[PDB]
Each structure stands twice: as C-alpha cells, then as structure tokens.
C-alpha cells in the first residue's frame, strides 16, 4: 500500500493515584492519542552517459 502514514502520540497518564485502600473499579484513567499525517511522493532524476563515441 502507501500514499500515507498516520502515527500516534500517546499523552502521559496524569491523574491523582488512589491511596489507602479505596476502590478503583470506577476511576479508570482513559488513554488519549494525537495524530498526524505523512504523505509520500517519489523523486526521480536521470543521469546520462554519452553516446558510444
């Protein structure tokens, strides 16, 4: 395939931790991602050795 690449950056999990034996089945830290786009197109050039003479 091709024409594009889309890679992601994951933000670090900042969040107040739960001390002293509370419950954490509810307060579940959610992952967030940022993305961008990379587009590719070929670049070509042509050197030319001369004629047989």
């Amino acid at each position: 395939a091709g024409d594009r690449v889309s890679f992601d950056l994951s933000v670090r999990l900042r969040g107040q931790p739960t001390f002293g034996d509370d419950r954490v089945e509810g307060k579940e830290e959610n992952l967030k991602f940022y993305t961008d786009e990379v587009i590719i197109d070929q670049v070509r050039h042509s050197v030319s050795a001369g004629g047989r003479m």
Partner: protein, 155 residues
C-alpha cells in the same frame, strides 16, 4: 477566557459505571482564585461518554458579595473535545438556565425540562459553567461545585 478545572485537564478522572443503569456521581469542583467575570467559560467536569445526566446539583458558595447581586450561572454541554484550551469553544444553557444561587450560595437542583433530555454521544463532552452576567466585585478563592448524576448505557 477559560478557567479550566482539574477534571477537564485530566488531572482528576471521572467515574464510569461498570453496568447500565448504575447512577454514578462525582463532585466537579474548582477553587478559582482570579474571581469570576463576565463571559468566563468555566469548564468544571465532563460527561464520561455514552452518559446522560439524570440529576444535576450545584454547590456554589457566596460568589457575589454585595447588595442586589446580578450574577448568573448557566451550566451546559460544551462543543469541542475535552481538555482543549480553545477560547472559541461555546457553552449552551441546556442543563441549567440562569441559576441565581451564586448571589447568596446554597444548593440548586435541576429544574429545566432539558436537564434530563440530553442525547448521548460516543466521545467525551465537557460540562461548563458560563458566568453570563458580570457580577459585582466577587471574592477570589471561592469554590464552585456541580454534582452530576449521570447514567450510562441508556436507550
């Protein structure tokens, strides 16, 4: 001029029920120190996803000290994503419609007919307070709290 809370920045996560029909509530609060002003979109907390608010409670302090205060607070569901410091973001008046509890304090419960008719969406939305009327000189370091009851997996 957004005054972005702790819950919006992600520094304090919001609960989600592990089942449908469980009512999950958390205290969306701030200790704002620059004092409120006209047109400050205060982003308290976030609906955690496919969740519909089912009971809304404010717990503001005496946020405008003086004679005949004109302060108003209309919470609502903000437009853009969570935790994006964009002044262009707007806040509607769905959940509350110009509560006057900032004048003296106390607690107000949801009374608008649109409080319980919020439609769910697949990505987190943020509930924000807008001080639509610039109050008299308001004390700094005053707390604002919006205790939401939201139920997930509605029909």
């Amino acid at each position: 001029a957004l005054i972005q809370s702790d819950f919006a920045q992600g520094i304090r996560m919001t609960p989600v029920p592990d089942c449908a029909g469980d009512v999950t509530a958390c205290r969306f609060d701030i200790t704002l120190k620059n004092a409120p002003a006209a047109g400050d979109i205060i982003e308290l907390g976030v609906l955690p996803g496919n969740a519909v608010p089912v009971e809304a409670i404010l717990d503001v302090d005496d946020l405008d000290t003086g004679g005949a205060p004109t302060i108003t607070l209309d919470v609502g569901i903000m437009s853009g994503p969570v935790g994006k410091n964009d002044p262009a973001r707007t806040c509607g008046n769905e959940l509350f419609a110009a509560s006057t509890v900032g004048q003296a304090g106390g607690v107000v419960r949801a009374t608008a007919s649109s409080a319980f008719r919020i439609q769910k969406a697949e990505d987190h939305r943020s509930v924000g307070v807008k001080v639509a009327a610039g109050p008299a000189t308001g004390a700094a370091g005053k707390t604002i709290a919006l205790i939401l009851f939201y139920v997930q997996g509605t029909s």
